[PDB]
């Protein structure tokens, strides 16, 4: 569907925290004994509302909640870390879960430059 922000307000700016993707530490900062404590493993960034992504993000997390809660009700796992890996697997199964009929609408093989041959 489309996402229509239906919230009373929207903070259009997004001051965010997260963790870095690898990144060679300056010397021995990767060793846990020498590295930062739990409080200092975060980076920060600021993202504005170009293309309205911030306000759409807030509406998307709001609308995700019902499905997420129903998923958490049905699982017996105390802590779920596998949603994104399972979405990656679903991505591959949607495209490659059966035989790929070329020129078909559910097969992502393009022999365009194989057609000019």
């Amino acid at each position: 569907e489309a996402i229509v922000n239906a919230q009373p307000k929207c903070n259009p700016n997004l001051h965010y925290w997260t963790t870095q993707d690898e990144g060679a530490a300056i010397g021995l900062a990767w060793i846990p004994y020498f590295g930062p404590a739990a409080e200092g493993i975060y980076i920060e960034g600021l993202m504005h509302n170009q293309d309205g992504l911030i306000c759409g993000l807030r509406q998307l997390a709001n609308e995700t909640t019902q499905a997420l809660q129903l998923f958490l009700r049905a699982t017996t796992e105390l802590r779920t870390f596998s949603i994104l890996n399972r979405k990656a697997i679903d991505f591959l199964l949607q495209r490659w879960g059966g035989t790929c009929h070329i020129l078909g609408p559910d097969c992502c093989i393009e022999p365009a430059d194989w057609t000019k041959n």
């Binding site: 919230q7 965010y16 802590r79 609408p105």
Partner: protein, 238 residues
Amino acid sequence: SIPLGVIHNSALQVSDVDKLVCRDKLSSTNQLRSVGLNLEGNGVATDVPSATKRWGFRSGVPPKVVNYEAGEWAENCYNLEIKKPDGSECLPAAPDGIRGFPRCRYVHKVSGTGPCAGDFAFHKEGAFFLYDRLASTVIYRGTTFAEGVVAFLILPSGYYSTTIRYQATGFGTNETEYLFEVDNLTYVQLESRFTPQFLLQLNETIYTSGKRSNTTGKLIWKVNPEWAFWEXXXXXXX
């Protein structure tokens, strides 16, 4: 399926399932991100009396935890130490590995008592209590959290935190009383209207006007009347 966000035509949108889009590319698991947004950013009331009314106790529902990889700096967080009148703890200790929310400008630490008619405290609107990269459906004792919700999507000044302490009776009820604490013997009757900055300013004037209790009993002040954040002796003060 749990919704998954994707950027089509310079606009975010939920990917329709039964429609396959071969032009969308997922090159690695790194392109998938889980993300937590604060109810703050949607304009909810963040003052302690309004915020606590969104939480409630319930039994029979086992707690559930889901992780998220990135979060948002919060203006308001909360930290609860609630006991029953007989002194038994109302909230469970934080499970191993669950730390407080990592970025809070104001931590509202509420201590006090309530009936706590339920094994766990849930969010009445179904939101999540956001901890350090872990989102829980329940509240843990003495652990700082922001109210929030989680999103999943496919990619294509320092940190200052100050604690504001409160006292509560009848927590989790229709008749809850709150007191802002300026020291262990001097309190101010709390109103929804009081912002975090107003509480810090009022605290300093009480300290600089010598209006603290210079006895051994509790001194309680009331105060006269006197847009979102990003845009036994009683008395009076006017």
